[PDB]
Amino acid sequence: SPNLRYPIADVSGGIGMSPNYRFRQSMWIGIVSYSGSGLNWRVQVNSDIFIVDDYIHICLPAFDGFSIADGGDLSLNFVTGLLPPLLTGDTEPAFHNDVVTYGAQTVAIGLSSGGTPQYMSKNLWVEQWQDGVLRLRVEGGGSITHSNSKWPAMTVSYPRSF
Amino acid sequence: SPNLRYPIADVSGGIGMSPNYRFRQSMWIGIVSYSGSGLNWRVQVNSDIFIVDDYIHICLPAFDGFSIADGGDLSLNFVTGLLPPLLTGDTEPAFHNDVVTYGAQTVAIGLSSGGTPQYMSKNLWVEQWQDGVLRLRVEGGGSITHSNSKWPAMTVSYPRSFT
Amino acid sequence: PNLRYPIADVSGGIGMSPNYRFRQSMWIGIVSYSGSGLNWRVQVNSDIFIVDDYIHICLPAFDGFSIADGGDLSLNFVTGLLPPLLTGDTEPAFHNDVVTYGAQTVAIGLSSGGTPQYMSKNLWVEQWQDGVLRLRVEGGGSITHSNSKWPAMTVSYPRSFT
Numbered sequence A: 001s002p003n004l005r006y007p008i009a010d011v012s013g014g015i016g017m018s019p020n021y022r023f024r025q026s027m028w029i030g031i032v033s034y035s036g037s038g039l040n041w042r043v044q045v046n047s048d049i050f051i052v053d054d055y056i057h058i059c060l061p062a063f064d065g066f067s068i069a070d071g072g073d074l075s076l077n078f079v080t081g082l083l084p085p086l087l088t089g090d091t092e093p094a095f096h097n098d099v100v101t102y103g104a105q106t107v108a109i110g111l112s113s114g115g116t117p118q119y120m121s122k123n124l125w126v127e128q129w130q131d132g133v134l135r136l137r138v139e140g141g142g143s144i145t146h147s148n149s150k151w152p153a154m155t156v157s158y159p160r161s162f
Numbered sequence B: 001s002p003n004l005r006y007p008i009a010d011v012s013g014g015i016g017m018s019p020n021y022r023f024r025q026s027m028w029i030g031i032v033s034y035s036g037s038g039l040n041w042r043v044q045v046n047s048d049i050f051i052v053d054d055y056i057h058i059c060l061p062a063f064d065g066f067s068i069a070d071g072g073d074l075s076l077n078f079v080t081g082l083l084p085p086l087l088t089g090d091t092e093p094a095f096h097n098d099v100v101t102y103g104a105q106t107v108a109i110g111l112s113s114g115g116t117p118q119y120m121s122k123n124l125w126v127e128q129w130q131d132g133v134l135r136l137r138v139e140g141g142g143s144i145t146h147s148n149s150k151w152p153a154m155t156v157s158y159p160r161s162f163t
Numbered sequence C: 001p002n003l004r005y006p007i008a009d010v011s012g013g014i015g016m017s018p019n020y021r022f023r024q025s026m027w028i029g030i031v032s033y034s035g036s037g038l039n040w041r042v043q044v045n046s047d048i049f050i051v052d053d054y055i056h057i058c059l060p061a062f063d064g065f066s067i068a069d070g071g072d073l074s075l076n077f078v079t080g081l082l083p084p085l086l087t088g089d090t091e092p093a094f095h096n097d098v099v100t101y102g103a104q105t106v107a108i109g110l111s112s113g114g115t116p117q118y119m120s121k122n123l124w125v126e127q128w129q130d131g132v133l134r135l136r137v138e139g140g141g142s143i144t145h146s147n148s149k150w151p152a153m154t155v156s157y158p159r160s161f162t
């Protein structure tokens, strides 16, 4: 109705909440890039996206990468790979390009040289979204000599811009 | 207020947001079951449930189980044990019975055989809800030889169905 | 119409208050540990995000002293909140109930000035009382140590609306 404003909407002939606001599902098939202490690699991932109320959730699957540093960045390039009609701008946080420490959590990453991984307890958080790239910080928990990393499934969530 | 549709509701004579939508508390007294690589066991938990906006949160307490595999499933049976007037259908995700990797997190589980536990950081996620049973994947982090598992308190959350 | 927050006038129609959807603040305050006769405090500068019916407290990494196998981490919201946020704004929707909310893994580095050993502890929101939020931190075993390296931790819970 012309006298209602999204997320408020006509719901079977009355005043309700837009179903689209309550739950929207999408997908990202795209590139995750790691950078830290001169180490750089990238990997393609298939990830569900769920937008629920004023939050976005990016459900990353387990993946394998190469060497990581004590501290580093994991970057999700949303500039391509989003399933239409979801656009890059739809992934911008409500704090826009502010630098933050949002949703900080433990992530166990298995470091190896081909053999039995040693799992390190690292600290991950959403740090910054900039020009359609979501940057996550991954640091702490110490490290070992390794050439491969086994990354767990990780859900990345934050407040979405409206 | 025939013109209104939940979660929009009459609030002190005007148009507001239903308090029931904003916060609801409940309880599940029920059975958590583990299955992985031919290992099966179950325990009872008494767990708070919070429904807040379009999310449901299941606050599992710490519990003790037996042997686990490198990878396996932890299943919560919502068919029984929900506090009235909550029903089994109330726990269906907004992605219904789709197979997902939602709310993936680290859980540290203490593995022992009567002595001091070794804590394994494993990877847990909501995988699938089917006919009132919520299936959580628990994998990764390696393992040791063990007969007993000490599970931490874990909160499991996901967007909740509304039609 | 007679609108009731968070329903509010938006651009001439009935919509959702932007304030309900996203609010960003800060808490510059004192975090106190207590367990088994151990007591210490630190200063934190932390972002607060209020999004829909949730509050998120984004604690930065900090260093403290000895911890017990089980103990309490307490956030003093009586002071330090950035105006116009007030202490009452941090009350959970379960008010002063004792709960086990948002239980998660937290890896904490225990040392005596040398290389930390990281212990996977279990943290949850336990109770808010008179402007003090009590978090429980237990499990994962322990070692003899004089210092603790705490990771960045985000603490979230449903927020009271009165």
Ligand SMILES: [Mg+2]
Binding pocket: C072
């Ligand atoms: Mg106590």
